[PDB]
Design a protein around this ligand. Sequence first.
Ligand SMILES: *[C@@H]1O[C@H](CO)[C@@H](O)[C@H](O)[C@H]1NC(C)=O
Ligand SMILES: *[C@@H]1O[C@H](CO)[C@@H](O)[C@H](O)[C@H]1NC(C)=O
Ligand SMILES: *[C@@H]1O[C@H](CO)[C@@H](O)[C@H](O)[C@H]1NC(C)=O
Ligand SMILES: *[C@@H]1O[C@H](CO)[C@@H](O)[C@H](O)[C@H]1NC(C)=O
Ligand SMILES: *[C@@H]1O[C@H](CO)[C@@H](O)[C@H](O)[C@H]1NC(C)=O
Ligand SMILES: *[C@@H]1O[C@H](CO)[C@@H](O)[C@H](O)[C@H]1NC(C)=O
Ligand SMILES: *[C@@H]1O[C@H](CO)[C@@H](O)[C@H](O)[C@H]1NC(C)=O
Ligand SMILES: *[C@@H]1O[C@H](CO)[C@@H](O)[C@H](O)[C@H]1NC(C)=O
Ligand SMILES: *[C@@H]1O[C@H](CO)[C@@H](O)[C@H](O)[C@H]1NC(C)=O
Ligand SMILES: *[C@@H]1O[C@H](CO)[C@@H](O)[C@H](O)[C@H]1NC(C)=O
Ligand SMILES: *[C@@H]1O[C@H](CO)[C@@H](O)[C@H](O)[C@H]1NC(C)=O
Ligand SMILES: *[C@@H]1O[C@H](CO)[C@@H](O)[C@H](O)[C@H]1NC(C)=O
Lengths: 135, 135, 135
Amino acid sequence: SIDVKYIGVKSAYVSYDVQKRTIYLNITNTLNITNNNYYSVEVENITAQVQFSKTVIGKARLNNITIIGPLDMKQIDYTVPTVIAEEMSYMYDFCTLISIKVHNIVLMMQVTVTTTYFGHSEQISQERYQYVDCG
Amino acid sequence: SIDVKYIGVKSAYVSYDVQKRTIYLNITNTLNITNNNYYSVEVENITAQVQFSKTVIGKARLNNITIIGPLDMKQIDYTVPTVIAEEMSYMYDFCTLISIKVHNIVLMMQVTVTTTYFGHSEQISQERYQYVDCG
Amino acid sequence: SIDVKYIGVKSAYVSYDVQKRTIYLNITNTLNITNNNYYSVEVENITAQVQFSKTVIGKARLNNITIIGPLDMKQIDYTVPTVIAEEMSYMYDFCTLISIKVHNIVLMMQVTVTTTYFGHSEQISQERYQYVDCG
Ligand SMILES: *[C@@H]1O[C@H](CO)[C@@H](O)[C@H](O)[C@H]1NC(C)=O
Ligand SMILES: *[C@@H]1O[C@H](CO)[C@@H](O)[C@H](O)[C@H]1NC(C)=O
Ligand SMILES: *[C@@H]1O[C@H](CO)[C@@H](O)[C@H](O)[C@H]1NC(C)=O
Ligand SMILES: *[C@@H]1O[C@H](CO)[C@@H](O)[C@H](O)[C@H]1NC(C)=O
Ligand SMILES: *[C@@H]1O[C@H](CO)[C@@H](O)[C@H](O)[C@H]1NC(C)=O
Ligand SMILES: *[C@@H]1O[C@H](CO)[C@@H](O)[C@H](O)[C@H]1NC(C)=O
Ligand SMILES: *[C@@H]1O[C@H](CO)[C@@H](O)[C@H](O)[C@H]1NC(C)=O
Ligand SMILES: *[C@@H]1O[C@H](CO)[C@@H](O)[C@H](O)[C@H]1NC(C)=O
Ligand SMILES: *[C@@H]1O[C@H](CO)[C@@H](O)[C@H](O)[C@H]1NC(C)=O
Ligand SMILES: *[C@@H]1O[C@H](CO)[C@@H](O)[C@H](O)[C@H]1NC(C)=O
Ligand SMILES: *[C@@H]1O[C@H](CO)[C@@H](O)[C@H](O)[C@H]1NC(C)=O
Ligand SMILES: *[C@@H]1O[C@H](CO)[C@@H](O)[C@H](O)[C@H]1NC(C)=O
């Protein structure tokens, strides 16, 4: 990465900004920009790149082989009882949430057993979180 | 990475900013920018890159093999009872949350058993957290 | 990394900033910038890079092999009883939370058993935390 920027409201290379109830009288502006950008990014010069994988088995007896990849998500229980008994009452529930395992951004790569990789891996995330807003 | 920037509200290379109720009278501005940027980033020169993996088995007896990858997420219980008994009452629940295992940003890479990698891995995250806002 | 910056509100290379209720009278501005940036970042010159892995087994008897990767997340119980008995009362619950294992940013890399890596690993995180805001 080169340039990652947080800007909440206003991004401006040049901003002549005037707010409300202003007397903008007798202003003379002269502006010159000579902006030059040169990028030479992510260059590879490989004469020879070799990835080699060999598995050899010879007169071998194999038994009881178990191979499990990542994320073995197994034997899990969720129990959220909600038992409400009522009699002659005044209920006022305005902003109440019951959230179970909510996914917002999930990013997973190359989640494997055997991997041979030559190169680049890049992730960028930019949001603004706001879960609950109740007036 | 080169340039990572936090800006909450306003980002400006040049900002002539005037707020409210202002008398902006008799101003003369002369502005010159000569901005030059040169980037030579992430360059690799490899004459020979070799990755080698060999597994050899010879007249071998194998039994009871168990290989488990990462994140063996196993035998877990969640129990959240909510038993409310009522009689002749006034309930006022405004902003109440019941949150269980909420995912917001999950980033995981290359979560494997056997990995051979040559290169770059980059992650950038920029947000603004705000879970609960109740008036 | 080179330049990581915290800016809460306002970031400006040049800021002529005037607030409210101001008499900006008779101002003469002359401004010159000659800004030059040169970057030569993350350069590698390898004539020969070799990664070598060999496993050899010869007439060997193997039994009771258990290999477990990282994050063996096993046999865990959560119990949060909420038993409320009521009779003829006035309840005022404004801003109450019940949060269990909430994920906000989780970043994990290369969480493996066997890894052979040549290169770069970079992470940048910039947020603004605010869990509970209740008026
Ligand atoms: C604005 O400039 C003109 C010419 O320079 C001048 O005649 C005028 O009086 C100026 N305005 C004020 C309010 O002085
Ligand atoms: C930019 O413009 C101004 C306006 O008069 C001038 O004086 C200056 O020489 C210019 N610069 C370039 C690099 O063009
Ligand atoms: C890649 O190409 C040739 C091969 O070695 C090399 O001479 C050249 O300088 C390299 N180019 C860049 C932009 O790095
Ligand atoms: C392992 O082998 C025994 C007998 O050889 C068998 O009963 C058992 O089920 C095997 N394990 C698995 C996980 O299959
Ligand atoms: C603004 O400038 C002009 C010309 O220089 C001048 O005549 C005028 O009086 C100035 N304004 C004030 C308020 O002095
Ligand atoms: C920028 O502009 C000003 C305006 O007069 C000038 O005096 C100066 O020589 C300029 N500089 C360049 C580098 O162009
Ligand atoms: C990569 O390419 C050639 C190969 O060695 C080298 O002479 C050159 O200087 C390198 N280029 C850069 C931009 O590093
Ligand atoms: C290990 O081997 C025994 C007998 O050889 C078998 O009963 C058992 O199930 C094996 N273990 C697993 C995890 O399968
Ligand atoms: C602003 O400048 C002009 C010209 O230099 C001058 O005539 C005027 O009186 C100035 N303003 C004030 C308030 O003195
Ligand atoms: C920048 O601009 C000013 C404006 O007059 C000038 O005097 C100066 O020589 C300039 N410098 C360069 C490096 O252009
Ligand atoms: C990398 O390329 C060649 C190979 O040795 C070397 O002469 C050159 O100076 C290097 N380039 C950089 C930018 O370091
Ligand atoms: C280890 O071996 C014994 C008998 O050889 C078997 O009963 C047991 O289950 C094995 N352990 C595991 C974890 O499988």
